[PDB]
From a paper:
Here, we report a δ-poly-L-ornithine synthetase from [name], which we name PosA. Nonribosomal peptide synthetase ([name]) enzymes, usually composed of condensation, adenylation, and thiolation domains, are involved in peptide natural product biosynthesis to produce antibiotics and siderophores. Activity analyses show that the [name] homolog activates L-Orn and the full-length protein produces isopeptide polymers in vitro. Structures of the isolated adenylation domain from PosA are presented with several diamino acids and biochemical assays identify important substrate binding residues.
To better understand the substrate binding in PosA, we solved four structures of the isolated adenylation domain. Substrates bind at the center of the core adenylation domain where residues mainly from subdomain I mediate binding. Glu221 showed charged interaction with terminal δ-amine of ornithine substrates or the ε-amino group of lysine indicating an important role in binding. The polar side chains of Thr304 and Ser313 were also found to be placed at hydrogen bonding distances of 2.9 and 2.6 Å from the terminal amine group of L-ornithine. The structures with substrates revealed Asp217, Met218, Glu221, Thr304, and Ser313 as interacting residues with the diamine substrates. Mutation of individual residues showed Asp217 and Glu221 were the most important residues for substrate activation since no enzymatic activity was observed in these mutants even at high protein or substrate concentration. Removal of the hydroxyl group from the side chains of Thr304 and Ser313 showed 33- and 183-fold reduction in catalytic efficiency in T304A and S313A mutants, respectively, indicating these residues are also important for binding. The enzyme assay with L-ornithine showed the highest activity while low activity was observed with DAB. This suggested L-ornithine was the most preferred substrate for the εPLs homolog from [name].
Numbering used by the authors: 6 to 411
């Protein structure tokens, strides 16, 4: 028996479906074809047209030899073409390796080499900056040429990678984090069952594809058919102008970090959902923003367990914590020798559930050191603990408390 020292999210086995990312998008495109998916300044793209164009690109990728399981790099400016190329890689059954706008070419080369990628997509302009990159470089423009014959795309499977994250800005040994199709489809359903992004929402898209939170901006939206407002690079660094733009554009969903939100001059009343990740929200910020017409959330979780692992509804005057695990996620605490600690003792925080990553690409050493068997799995989806390296304790209310690094 005995709970108290193992904390589980809500039980929702229906969030585990026999699906891949392409399935989620194709469903949305087929049921809402004329609905606007992407808007970039003045340009609008519907889900139907987005799906058709991404499909042309995926067929070109298949002609050039990319198959489910392959890894394709992605390096384009913020905007519609970037998301289209992401989706193109996805529809081909491959997984994409996203690169931030400011990734130096030599880092790109190092990461493509480490991932054993089959190539990457970039723009015409940026192709030149890639002389040092040995790997095959395809341009979006080239991949959107009219097709001669229909190129039948083979489907990937849940066990295959959906995307590989090389931590953006790392200068040390490349560490590729392999997120599977299963991981990310589960996450999308699990977190949205609480966030509740809906088709009629218009969601700000201000994150670089190299960051976890871009998924909450992008794929949560794809999940229900919401509209994305893609931020230009110029706006990303102007908080007062952003605060104004969100008003004028009637944005209903903001995913952001707390330091950005604190720099907003005034309230943005029309904001239905505010999802703060990356840092624990300060209390002054909650006091200012946890207003009645705002659903304000604080999400926590390492990249190694797909985007987020816990979430909390934050409330004026209630101390900010990391909240409860997302549905089907679980957290427990261990000691130096990988032993389950009693409730209240301080140890390393570990995460389990269907969204634990596959591991670190090509590094069985580190992977086995950080992804350990879960002696206490009450189910096959719980057999793998990820060791965050954070110290934590479970308090007398069944709540997890971070206490820094180990
Ligand atoms: N939903 C955001 C959680 C924190 C994020 N995975 C990060 O690594 O910053």
């Amino acid at each position: 028996t005995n709970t108290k020292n193992v904390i589980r999210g809500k039980y929702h086995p229906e969030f585990l479906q026999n699906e891949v990312l392409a399935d989620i998008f194709a469903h949305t495109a087929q049921t809402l074809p004329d609905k606007t998916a992407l808007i970039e300044a003045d340009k609008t793209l519907s889900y139907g047209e987005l799906y058709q164009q991404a499909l042309i690109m995926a067929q070109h990728l298949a002609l050039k030899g990319v198959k489910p399981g392959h890894i394709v790099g992605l390096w384009l400016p913020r905007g519609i073409e970037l998301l289209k190329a992401q989706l193109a890689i996805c529809l081909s059954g491959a997984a994409w390796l996203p690169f931030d706008m400011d990734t130096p070419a030599d880092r790109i080369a190092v990461c493509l080499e480490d991932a054993e990628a089959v190539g990457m997509i970039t723009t015409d302009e940026w192709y030149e900056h890639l002389a040092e990159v040995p790997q095959t470089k395809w341009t979006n423009t080239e991949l959107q040429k009219p097709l001669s014959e229909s190129v039948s795309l083979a489907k990937t499977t849940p066990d295959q990678p959906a995307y590989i994250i090389y931590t953006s800005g790392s200068t040390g040994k490349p560490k590729g984090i392999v997120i599977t199709q299963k991981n990310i489809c589960h996450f999308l359903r699990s977190e949205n069952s609480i966030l509740g992004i809906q088709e009629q929402d218009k969601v700000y898209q201000g994150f670089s594809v190299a960051f976890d939170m871009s998924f909450e901006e992008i794929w949560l939206s794809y999940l229900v058919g919401a509209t994305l407002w893609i931020a230009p690079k110029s706006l990303v660094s102007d908080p007062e102008r952003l605060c104004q733009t969100l008003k004028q554009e009637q944005i209903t969903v903001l995913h952001a970090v707390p330091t950005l939100l604190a720099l907003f001059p005034e309230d943005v009343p029309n904001l239905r959902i505010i999802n703060l990740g990356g840092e624990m929200c300060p209390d002054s910020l909650v006091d200012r923003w946890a207003l009645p017409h705002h659903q304000m959330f604080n999400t926590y979780g390492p990249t190694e367990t797909t985007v987020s692992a816990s979430l909390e509804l934050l409330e004026r005057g209630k101390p900010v914590t990391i909240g409860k695990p997302l549905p089907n996620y679980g957290m427990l605490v261990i000691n130096s020798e990988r032993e389950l600690l009693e409730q209240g003792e301080t140890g390393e925080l570990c995460i389990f559930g269907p969204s634990v990553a596959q591991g670190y690409l090509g590094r069985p050493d580190l992977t086995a050191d950080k992804f350990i068997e879960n002696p206490w799995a009450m189910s096959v989806e719980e057999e793998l603990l990820y060791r965050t390296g954070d110290l934590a304790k479970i308090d007398e209310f069944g709540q997890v408390h971070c206490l820094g690094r180990a």
